[PDB]
């Protein structure tokens, strides 16, 4: 990949389970009538977050468990591991089989980490969400339907990236992620308007990129 | 080779007759236990079967036992393998006889098993009969009573957990969300001897299942 | 690297930010008074917490934020990771390039882990500080001043290690990292007088390689 491309996300592995054991239900503390669930490994987490929340909006699902794994999966120990893991529940199979089509065919078509750099060696997340569904809202603490600029980058470029990014819009920070993330990423959420949002991924896309061009110069 | 057990290597062990006192309390150790034995593995899970094992064996406590970030395959170093445990007791003598059991048991009664024939997916399926006082207290059970230790990585293991969970007259105890640190899943689940044997077949048999056709839902 | 060869350690990438943003400083936990913030990351995480403490001592800065990278840097996936990052805070930007320069200065030349093998699969920080800085100091919840051991090991070594020096002069465990930590290591902090510490470090660094050259005769 060259500078500027961006870097496919690819769904591992995916199963339906109609009837979830009722132990299982305890544990992962599911809803009232949700009785099924989904689950999905992918090579991508923030992509995958991203896709989890969508899936909210285009099926009678919630996202029941969401966690990244250490070290990324540039690291991964097995083959169907990835570096993350998305479950989502709802009242039937069918809404569950709905939500995993829209969580699958986001994370491969809909959203991509970006190289910074020629060889491949840093990359960021600058993703607009005109509208939230009910996880990212629940994550960030805002109601559902706002929007979010999801800003993601190792750890000190994040960090340098998103005062740039507060500092480009009028935006309001809504969740911090101090890296390093179990990927050895950080970043954070950022909400306002739709418009704001964009000239924050911007700002924080651009900002990525001059620090992995120049990082010792400060 | 799909099938085939993936042994499990011991890498470092130490015997400390009579520790220091800062360090006892940051282990918790009883007044009673100065002495600690100290080992390294390359697999976690089979470990702390072994630790488990080693209470029923000698005069031991497991003082200490966590597993690391990234699993064997990303270790830094030559002696971390994935898993550090401690045995305390009372005496060096004891703290051998249990490191003994230990070392016995990890080099030659449990075993991961690989799912594929590439050996890049593997579970831990594991029927202990009777627990000792390690893994009764960490499930949260009485001591003897049987356990079904499965373990695999975090897609296979949470639908292999629900599989097995239906196989038999079982009930989940302790419940490994995905990831653990070395970014693997699973539970252990209780129930009779025979019960616990059913569900470590129908958890080997699902995760299978899943290597075989991961994208088919 | 052979034997006792000491293993320099690297500053990655550096961003000095003179005037962060309000929400980021709350999430920071900086002082009202602290606005400037200085960001650096390297490849060994001990090393850079030993700077960081040191950087506090001719500058006016304090240690925002100092954490390590899951899997260390043998598992960095990318460039700019390495293992640790560390934020100073600082009233002004002057301030901080300071307490910047005085950290980098440090990671590169003033502290390392050394080598207790041939392949150098095998290594150890045995580090004695005369006198603490405000970071490591509260870090182990002694007066600012007071001299430390800074004992560090892979983890079965760290343990046995940790017991020799204990043993070794009339130290105090003052900090304990029960292993693994975020890097896989494991150790603690000693204090004593200086010559006490100093005498802790030498036993720490010889327990260490009796270990690497005897690692199942116990
Ligand atoms: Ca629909
Ligand atoms: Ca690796
Ligand atoms: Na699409
Ligand atoms: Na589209």
Redesign the interface.
């Known amino acids: 990949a060259m500078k500027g491309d961006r870097l496919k996300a690819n ?7 109609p009837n ?2 009722s ?2 239900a305890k ?1 992962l503390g599911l809803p009232n009538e949700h009785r099924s669930i ?4 992918a090579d991508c987490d923030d992509v995958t977050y991203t896709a989890l929340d969508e899936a909210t909006k285009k099926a009678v699902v919630d996202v029941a ?1 969401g ?15 990835g570096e993350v ?1 998305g ?1 989502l529940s709802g009242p039937t199979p069918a809404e569950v ?1 709905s939500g ?1 089509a829209a969580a699958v065919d986001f994370i491969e078509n809909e959203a991509a980490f970006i190289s910074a ?1 020629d ?1 491949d ?3 960021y997340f600058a993703h607009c969400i005109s509208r939230t569904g009910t996880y990212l809202s629940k994550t960030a603490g805002i109601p559902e339907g706002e929007s979010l600029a999801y800003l993601i980058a ?4 994040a ?2 990236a ?2 740039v990014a ?2 480009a819009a009028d935006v ?2 809504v969740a ?1 992620y ?3 993330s ?5 970043g954070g959420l950022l909400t306002g308007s739709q418009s704001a949002c964009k000239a924050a991924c911007d700002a924080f896309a651009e900002a990525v990129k001059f ?2 061009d120049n ?2 110069n ?1």
């Not at 190792?154 to 470029?157: D, G």
């Not at 179990?182 to 950080?186: A, I, K, L, V």
Request: hydrophobic share 45%; aromatic share 10%.
């Open positions: 769904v591992l592995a995916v199963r339906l389970i979830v054991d132990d299982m544990e989904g689950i999905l490994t468990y966690k990244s794994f250490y070290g990324g999966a540039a690291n991964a120990n097995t083959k169907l591991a893991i479950i089989k995993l750099n060889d060696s840093i990359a190792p750890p000190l470029e960090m340098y998103l005062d507060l500092k309001r920070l911090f101090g890296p390093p179990e990927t050895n990423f950080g620090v992995a990082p010792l400060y």
